[PDB]
Ligand binder design. Structure first.
Ligand SMILES: CC(C)(COP(=O)(O)OP(=O)(O)OC[C@H]1O[C@@H](n2cnc3c(N)ncnc32)[C@H](O)[C@@H]1OP(=O)(O)O)[C@@H](O)C(=O)NCCC(=O)NCCS
Ligand SMILES: CC(C)(COP(=O)(O)OP(=O)(O)OC[C@H]1O[C@@H](n2cnc3c(N)ncnc32)[C@H](O)[C@@H]1OP(=O)(O)O)[C@@H](O)C(=O)NCCC(=O)NCCS
Lengths: 133, 120
C-alpha cells in the first residue's frame, strides 16, 4: 500500500482579484498551508516543534471560480526537499511547487513516508531554470 | 539619471503567524503586489523565491524591481527585498519597459538568480 498526503479544496472568492483566475501568490499561500499540514502530522506539531529556505512555483493551468483542486505532496530528497503538485478534477496538472526547508524522530516519519510514497516520473518543472527561450 | 521602481513597507503583525517572523507566503504577496504596481504605471508563468534573512516585527523593508530580460511577449523580472540597512532579506525572480530597462542601473546579479534547488 503506497500513500500520498493530500489536501483538496475549492477556489473561493477570496482567492480571485482580477479577470476570474486564482491570484498567483494565493497558490503559494495554499502550498505553504499544505506543507505545514504535512509537518504538523509528521512529528513537528506547533505543540511539538522548520524554516522555508527556498521555493519554485510554476503556473500551468488557470483556476476559475468554484474549481475544486487537489494538492499532493511528494518527498523528492532529504537530509528537506519537497515537490507538490496542484491538479484539477480532470487530473490536469495545474501548478507545481518545489520547496526546501531546514531546522532551527521526524526523520522517521519522513523516511517511512518517502519509503511508502509511489514512484512517479518527475515532470520537467522540477529544477527548471527560469529563462526566455 | 538612472531610476529604480521601489516600494517600501513595514512588517505588521498581519504578516506574522509563527516563530515571530514573517510567514513565507506573505513575501510572495508583497512581490506580486510590487510587480502589479509596476505594470500599472508602465499571467505569471513562473517564479522563484529565496529567504535569506528573517523579517521581524517593525522592520522597514524595500522591494526593488529589476528587468533581467524581456522579449516580444515575456517579462523576466528580478526583485530584491532588503532591510533598512541594506541587508538582502529575500529574492524573487519571475517569468510573466524597454526604457525602464535602458535606464536601470547595471548591477551584479546575486547567486540566487537562476539558482537550482538542491541539498548540498
Ligand atoms: C496562458 C496559457 C493558456 C498558455 O496558452 P498559449 O498562449 O497557447 O501558450 P503555450 O504555452 O500553449 O505555447 C507555447 C509558448 O509559450 C511559451 N512558454 C510557456 N511556458 C513558458 C515559460 N515558463 N517560460 C517562457 N516561455 C514559456 C513557450 O516558450 C512558447 O513560446 P513561443 O511562442 O515563443 O514558442 C496557460 O499557460 C495558462 O493558462 N497558465 C496559467 C497562468 C496562471 O493562472 N497564473 C497564476 C495566476 S496569474
Ligand atoms: C539560520 C538562518 C540564518 C540561515 O542561515 P545560516 O544559519 O547563516 O546558515 P549558513 O549559511 O551557515 O548555512 C547553513 C547550511 O544551510 C545550507 N543551505 C543554506 N541555504 C540553502 C538552500 N537554499 N538550499 C539548500 N541548502 C541550503 C548550507 O549549505 C549550509 O550547509 P551546512 O549546514 O552544511 O554548512 C536562517 O535563520 C535564515 O536564513 N533565516 C531566513 C528564513 C525565513 O525567514 N524564512 C521565511 C519564513 S519561514
Amino acid at each position: 500500500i503506497k500513500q500520498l498526503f493530500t489536501h483538496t479544496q475549492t477556489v473561493t472568492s477570496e482567492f480571485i482579484d482580477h479577470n476570474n483566475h486564482m491570484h498567483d501568490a494565493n497558490y503559494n499561500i495554499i502550498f505553504s498551508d499544505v506543507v505545514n499540514r504535512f509537518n504538523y502530522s509528521h512529528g513537528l506539531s506547533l505543540k511539538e516543534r522548520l524554516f522555508t529556505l527556498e521555493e519554485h512555483t510554476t503556473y500551468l493551468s488557470e483556476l476559475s471560480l468554484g474549481d475544486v483542486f487537489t494538492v499532493t505532496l511528494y518527498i523528492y530528497d532529504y537530509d528537506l526537499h519537497l515537490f507538490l503538485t496542484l491538479t484539477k478534477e480532470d487530473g490536469t496538472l495545474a501548478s507545481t511547487n518545489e520547496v526546501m526547508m531546514m531546522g532551527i524522530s521526524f526523520s522517521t516519519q519522513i523516511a517511512h513516508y518517502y519509503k511508502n510514497q509511489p514512484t512517479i516520473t518527475w515532470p520537467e518543472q522540477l529544477g527548471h531554470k527560469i529563462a526566455i527561450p
